Design an enzyme around this catalytic site. Structure first.
Site, short mmCIF file in Angstrom:
data_model
loop_
_atom_site.label_atom_id
_atom_site.label_comp_id
_atom_site.label_asym_id
_atom_site.label_seq_id
_atom_site.Cartn_x
_atom_site.Cartn_y
_atom_site.Cartn_z
N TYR A 1 0.81 -1.22 0.00
CA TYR A 1 0.00 0.00 0.00
C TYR A 1 0.85 1.27 0.00
CZ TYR A 1 -3.75 3.19 1.14
OH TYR A 1 -4.68 4.20 1.09
N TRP B 1 1.14 5.80 -1.51
CA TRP B 1 0.85 6.91 -2.39
C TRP B 1 1.85 7.12 -3.50
CZ3 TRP B 1 -2.37 11.30 -3.43
CH2 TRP B 1 -3.69 11.05 -3.02
N1 LIG Z 1 -3.40 7.71 12.45
C1 LIG Z 1 -3.63 7.90 11.06
N2 LIG Z 1 -4.52 8.84 10.63
C2 LIG Z 1 -4.75 9.04 9.31
O1 LIG Z 1 -5.58 9.89 9.00
C3 LIG Z 1 -4.05 8.28 8.38
N3 LIG Z 1 -4.20 8.40 6.94
C4 LIG Z 1 -4.09 7.09 6.26
C5 LIG Z 1 -4.25 7.28 4.79
S1 LIG Z 1 -5.80 7.96 4.20
C6 LIG Z 1 -3.26 6.96 3.93
S2 LIG Z 1 -3.60 7.08 2.17
O2 LIG Z 1 -5.42 6.66 1.87
C7 LIG Z 1 -1.91 6.48 4.45
C8 LIG Z 1 -0.79 7.04 3.55
O3 LIG Z 1 0.29 6.23 3.87
P1 LIG Z 1 1.42 6.13 2.57
O4 LIG Z 1 2.51 4.85 2.90
O5 LIG Z 1 0.80 6.21 1.03
O6 LIG Z 1 2.29 7.50 2.85
P2 LIG Z 1 3.43 8.24 1.96
O7 LIG Z 1 4.22 9.22 3.14
O8 LIG Z 1 2.70 9.08 0.70
O9 LIG Z 1 4.51 6.98 1.47
C9 LIG Z 1 4.78 7.04 0.10
C10 LIG Z 1 6.26 6.65 -0.05
O10 LIG Z 1 6.48 6.35 -1.42
C11 LIG Z 1 7.77 6.89 -1.73
N4 LIG Z 1 7.81 7.03 -3.17
C12 LIG Z 1 7.28 8.03 -3.94
N5 LIG Z 1 7.46 7.81 -5.28
C13 LIG Z 1 8.14 6.64 -5.32
C14 LIG Z 1 8.61 5.94 -6.42
O11 LIG Z 1 8.45 6.31 -7.57
N6 LIG Z 1 9.29 4.78 -6.19
C15 LIG Z 1 9.46 4.32 -4.89
N7 LIG Z 1 10.14 3.10 -4.71
N8 LIG Z 1 9.00 5.01 -3.80
C16 LIG Z 1 8.34 6.18 -4.07
C17 LIG Z 1 7.78 8.21 -0.97
O12 LIG Z 1 9.08 8.69 -0.86
C18 LIG Z 1 7.18 7.78 0.35
O13 LIG Z 1 8.15 7.38 1.30
O14 LIG Z 1 -1.70 6.91 5.77
C19 LIG Z 1 -2.75 6.36 6.54
N9 LIG Z 1 -2.41 6.47 7.95
C20 LIG Z 1 -3.14 7.32 8.84
N10 LIG Z 1 -2.95 7.14 10.18
N1 LIG Z 2 -2.17 18.64 2.61
C1 LIG Z 2 -2.57 17.28 2.55
N2 LIG Z 2 -1.86 16.30 3.16
C2 LIG Z 2 -2.25 15.00 3.11
O1 LIG Z 2 -1.57 14.16 3.69
C3 LIG Z 2 -3.41 14.65 2.41
N3 LIG Z 2 -3.89 13.30 2.29
C4 LIG Z 2 -4.86 13.03 1.22
C5 LIG Z 2 -5.56 11.73 1.45
S1 LIG Z 2 -4.71 10.20 1.08
C6 LIG Z 2 -6.78 11.67 2.03
S2 LIG Z 2 -7.52 10.01 2.11
C7 LIG Z 2 -7.55 12.93 2.36
C8 LIG Z 2 -8.10 12.81 3.80
O2 LIG Z 2 -9.23 13.61 3.80
P1 LIG Z 2 -9.96 13.53 5.38
O3 LIG Z 2 -11.48 14.28 5.32
O4 LIG Z 2 -9.94 11.97 6.01
O5 LIG Z 2 -8.94 14.44 6.26
P2 LIG Z 2 -8.52 14.58 7.81
O6 LIG Z 2 -7.28 15.77 7.77
O7 LIG Z 2 -8.04 13.07 8.42
O8 LIG Z 2 -9.94 15.12 8.62
C9 LIG Z 2 -10.55 16.25 8.10
C10 LIG Z 2 -11.07 17.01 9.32
O9 LIG Z 2 -11.81 16.12 10.13
C11 LIG Z 2 -11.69 16.69 11.45
N4 LIG Z 2 -12.11 15.68 12.41
C12 LIG Z 2 -11.36 14.73 13.04
N5 LIG Z 2 -12.09 13.94 13.87
C13 LIG Z 2 -13.34 14.42 13.75
C14 LIG Z 2 -14.53 14.03 14.35
O10 LIG Z 2 -14.68 13.11 15.14
N6 LIG Z 2 -15.66 14.72 14.01
C15 LIG Z 2 -15.63 15.79 13.13
N7 LIG Z 2 -16.84 16.45 12.85
N8 LIG Z 2 -14.46 16.18 12.53
C16 LIG Z 2 -13.35 15.46 12.87
C17 LIG Z 2 -10.21 17.03 11.56
O11 LIG Z 2 -10.01 17.99 12.57
C18 LIG Z 2 -9.93 17.56 10.17
O12 LIG Z 2 -9.95 18.97 10.09
O13 LIG Z 2 -6.75 14.08 2.33
C19 LIG Z 2 -5.97 14.11 1.17
N9 LIG Z 2 -5.32 15.41 1.05
C20 LIG Z 2 -4.12 15.67 1.79
N10 LIG Z 2 -3.70 16.96 1.86
MO LIG Z 3 -5.82 8.15 1.73
O LIG Z 4 -5.30 7.48 0.13
#
Ligand SMILES: NC1=NC(=O)C2=N[C@H]3C(S)=C(SO)[C@@H](COP(=O)(O)OP(=O)(O)OC[C@H]4O[C@@H](n5cnc6c(=O)[nH]c(N)nc65)[C@H](O)[C@@H]4O)O[C@H]3NC2=N1
Ligand SMILES: NC1=NC(=O)C2=N[C@H]3C(S)=C(S)[C@@H](COP(=O)(O)OP(=O)(O)OC[C@H]4O[C@@H](n5cnc6c(=O)[nH]c(N)nc65)[C@H](O)[C@@H]4O)O[C@H]3NC2=N1
Ligand SMILES: [Mo+6]
Ligand SMILES: [O]
Length: 779
Positions: A112, A114
């Protein structure tokens, strides 16, 4: 040495690089980008920062003992530099050994992450292309973003819903009277895109403000979204939004205001939900006063909001944090239930939308063709001969540590039971699980079950630090590619032109996997006899042929490459209203649910008999919540997405100077919570609970509501001692504190924002940060 300018793109947008003597010296935003991200400077810096990975390395213990290595020392930085030929021979031998000894069930290839945009240099798809040739692999399903919502929505409205085009922004400007951002901060999250972003939400938000539309934000934090609109700001205790929605619904029923005609003609099961709402089934009417006791939001405010939403054209734009929590399936299910009661689904500017905060949802779509890219080859194969015993070939992504700890055990998922496979090797590229996955201490111990862990990255992340074999990949800026601009808009196609030569001994993931496939005797199968530009031209040519048929004229490949971009025209995309055809004629245009209507009560889910996912939206106590009965820790951590990173990306760059506090990840804390602990602005604090302990630097602000602290996800975990169980993280990775449990048996999503902890001023021994400089042996 080259001097000049080159245009390319990234997850942050399109830009022009200035190149001086072969080095990139500045990235300037595209002149047509309506709102560039301030993070662009960090993207440039990531090419050259101190944590750039120079050479292929093998962990000393692994080099010397192989499968007999002491696995508790992964992450201590004791690496040996090796030649590329040595590294590739070893990776190929290990992939083959594991496939022959354990079968395809022994290799986890979900990987998994980004990564970076690009149709050819898609590292995770290239990984699976190679593993298919090696014999197979275990994959992951779903994602960490909408893990719960993407599984409940098909049972409620018939489709995924979260990754589908929204009612267009211009339609909202002309018709919406009340815009609600519920758990969404579009100004923060619209900076990036999965494919290149067009930043289309910004003009959309500006038009709403110019029209004077009433904006309401429901979020525990006073975000930039609140500040831009001067919005009415409601601050619920985190994890209580479903209680608030039930109080609103109860009010609508009690005052006889709800749309009975919409409910009767477009929904199913409201009569089985009414008794629950009125408290006939549990002796607890879900009134606004009941909701106030749980959420802290005044009963009268709950009632007034309900009345306002019913009398004005209202759009409920909800974000995804509230479903990234225990019982997360209930949040958007109840939101759709409330929206159904309001009766505006399918009207211009009314209803709900689950993607206004992500990748430009709502930006008018063009009539251009879709661009395709390299595939894993799975659809023209005959992969492994699989069957229960050996485990499921696919697991929900967030159950990766459960899988490692419990090989062969059964798990539930959307009405089916499956067995966890017995994995012995994991290969990760373009992802950072040692930052993104929950309950770091549990995960660190569980990883000892893997014989071999191979990682490709261009930065020394915590994941790369924990690998047995680390291979340095290139960035997008050291190669050529092609990609779409606009996940929903399909604004155009961009040539992602090479800016600089590969640094140090870095190689593209494509080149690395082609060399591993060659050692498996499958080289031509991997490459298809094509080189970089041959692959890129074939994708372009296919899109052009598709465009031709649809009446969209596109230049020949070399003419496109010379211009660097092609843009497509908008025909009727600006008039799109989601659910309009369903509203107009539900018999001719039914939803993809069993009844063809919105299912408030689901007979299908009732038959699954899951205690943690009932057959209608239900308030249930989560594992832990702020002010919950018998809660051990006092503060909820809003572990949300970073403003100045894309997850962990860019933490190891110059941008960190702008937000670190005494070198640590920032922790926002309300003045009263800081005063009670004798904490002052700028202090280093220890944040801890029963699962772990981390250091952060505090910023005192009333932007966070009392009882809530904000520590964004994405900080690079920097353990004091990898061999010490529960070791202190010196930097501030918030996932050291989260729990690793499924949202429910229905979706098995992650609960990354269900987190409580305590904070104290840190008075221990001084600590040295080591995560932002490469391991000594890797210099
Ligand atoms: N406690 C938590 N709260 C959250 O809200 C939360 N968010 C989730 C979500 S929502 C996601 S995404 O749907 C994941 C993201 O984790 P990910 O491992 O995609 O994070 P990145 O910091 O974007 O790691 C990407 C990684 O890839 C490297 N990279 C970029 N390009 C390349 C390439 O071409 N080739 C290689 N080999 N590698 C590449 C980057 O440098 C980077 O290190 O987080 C969750 N966790 C949450 N927790
Ligand atoms: N700048 C930036 N950085 C990123 O890492 C990033 N990640 C991208 C990705 S992969 C995703 S999936 C999306 C995530 O989009 P997502 O909507 O999941 O974003 P969050 O920042 O986790 O939460 C948005 C808001 O929810 C509020 N919140 C938290 N808990 C609660 C709650 O219990 N109730 C209510 N009403 N609000 C709450 C937080 O305070 C925050 O302001 O963002 C995308 N865009 C992103 N932008
Ligand atoms: Mo995400
Ligand atoms: O994501």
């Amino acid at each position: 040495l080259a001097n000049g300018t080159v245009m390319s793109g990234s997850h942050w947008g399109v830009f022009t690089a200035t190149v001086e003597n072969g080095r990139a010296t500045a990235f300037t935003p595209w002149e047509k980008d309506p709102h560039p991200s301030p993070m662009l400077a960090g993207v440039l810096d990531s090419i050259y920062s101190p944590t750039r990975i120079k050479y292929p390395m093998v962990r000393r213990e692994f080099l010397e003992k192989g499968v007999n290595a002491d696995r508790s020392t992964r992450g201590n930085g004791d690496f040996v530099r090796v030649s590329w030929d040595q590294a590739l021979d070893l990776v190929a031998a290990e992939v083959k050994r594991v496939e022959e000894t354990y079968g395809p069930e022994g290799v986890f290839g979900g990987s998994y992450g980004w990564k970076s945009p690009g149709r050819l240099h898609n590292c995770t798809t290239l990984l699976r292309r190679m593993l298919t040739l090696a014999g197979g692999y275990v994959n992951g399903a779903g994602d960490y973003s909408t893990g719960a919502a993407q599984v409940i929505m098909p049972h409620v409205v018939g489709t995924l819903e979260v990754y589908e085009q929204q009612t267009a922004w211009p339609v909202l400007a002309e018709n919406t009277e009340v815009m609600v951002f519920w758990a969404a901060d579009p100004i923060k999250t619209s900076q990036i895109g999965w494919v290149i972003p067009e930043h289309g939400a910004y003009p959309g938000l500006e038009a709403l403000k110019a029209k004077g539309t009433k904006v309401i934000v429901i979020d525990p934090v006073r975000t930039k979204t609140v500040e831009f609109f001067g919005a009415e700001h409601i601050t619920p205790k985190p994890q209580t939004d479903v209680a608030i929605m039930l109080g609103m619904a109860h009010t609508l029923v009690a005052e006889d205001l709800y749309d009975k005609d919409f409910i009767a003609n477009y929904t199913s099961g409201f009569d089985k939900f009414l008794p629950y709402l009125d408290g006939e089934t549990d002796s607890t009417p879900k009134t606004a006063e009941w909701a106030e006791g749980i959420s802290g939001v005044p009963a009268e405010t709950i009632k007034e909001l309900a009345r306002l939403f019913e009398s004005k054209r209202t759009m409920l734009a909800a974000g995804w944090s509230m479903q990234r929590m225990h019982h997360g399936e209930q949040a958007h299910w109840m939101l759709v239930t409330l929206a159904s009661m309001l009766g505006q689904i399918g009207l211009p500017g009314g209803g709900f939308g689950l993607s206004y905060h992500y990748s430009g949802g709502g930006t008018p779509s063009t009539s251009g063709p879709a661009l395709a890219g390299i595939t894993d080859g799975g659809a023209a194969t005959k992969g492994p001969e699989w069957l229960a015993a050996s485990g499921a070939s696919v697991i929900p992504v967030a159950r990766v540590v459960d899988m490692l700890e419990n090989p062969g055990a059964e798990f539930d998922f959307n009405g089916t039971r499956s067995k966890f496979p017995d994995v012995k090797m994991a290969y990760w590229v373009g992802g950072n699980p040692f930052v993104h996955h929950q309950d770091r201490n549990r995960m660190v111990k569980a990883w000892e079950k893997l014989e071999t862990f191979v990682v490709h990255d261009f930065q020394w992340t915590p994941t790369a630090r924990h690998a047995d074999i680390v291979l340095p990949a290139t960035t997008s800026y050291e190669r050529n590619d092609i990609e779409t601009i606009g996940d929903y808009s399909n604004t155009g196609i961009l040539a992602m032109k090479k800016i600089v030569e590969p640094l140090y001994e870095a190689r593209s993931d494509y080149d690395i996997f082609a060399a591993v496939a060659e050692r498996l005797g499958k080289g031509a199968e991997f490459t298809e006899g094509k080189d970089e530009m041959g692959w890129i031209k074939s994708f372009y040519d296919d899109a052009a042929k598709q465009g031709k048929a649809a009446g969209v004229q596109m230049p020949a490949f070399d003419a496109f490459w010379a211009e660097g971009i092609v843009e497509f025209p908008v025909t009727d995309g600006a008039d799109f209203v989601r659910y309009a055809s369903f509203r107009e004629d539900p018999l001719l245009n039914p939803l993809g649910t069993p009844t063809g209507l919105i299912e408030i009560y689901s007979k299908n889910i009732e038959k699954m008999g899951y205690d943690d996912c009932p057959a209608h939206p239900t308030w249930m106590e989560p594992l832990e919540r702020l002010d919950g009965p018998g809660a051990k820790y006092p503060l909820h951590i809003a572990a949300s997405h970073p403003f100045n990173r894309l997850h962990s990306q860019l933490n190891g760059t110059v941008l960190r100077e702008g937000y670190a506090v005494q070198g640590h990840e920032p922790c926002l804390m309300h003045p009263d919570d800081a005063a009670a602990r004798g904490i002052a602005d700028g202090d280093v604090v220890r944040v801890h609970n029963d699962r772990g302990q981390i250091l952060t630097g505090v910023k005192v602000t009333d932007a966070v509501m009392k009882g809530v602290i904000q520590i964004y996800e994405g900080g690079w975990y920097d353990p004091s001692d990898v061999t010490e169980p529960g070791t202190l993280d010196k930097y501030g990775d918030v996932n050291v504190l989260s729990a690793d449990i499924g949202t429910s048996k229905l979706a098995q999503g992650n609960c990354g924002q269900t987190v409580l902890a305590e904070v104290e001023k840190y008075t221990g021994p001084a600590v040295t940060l080591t995560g932002f400089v490469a391991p000594k042996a890797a210099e």
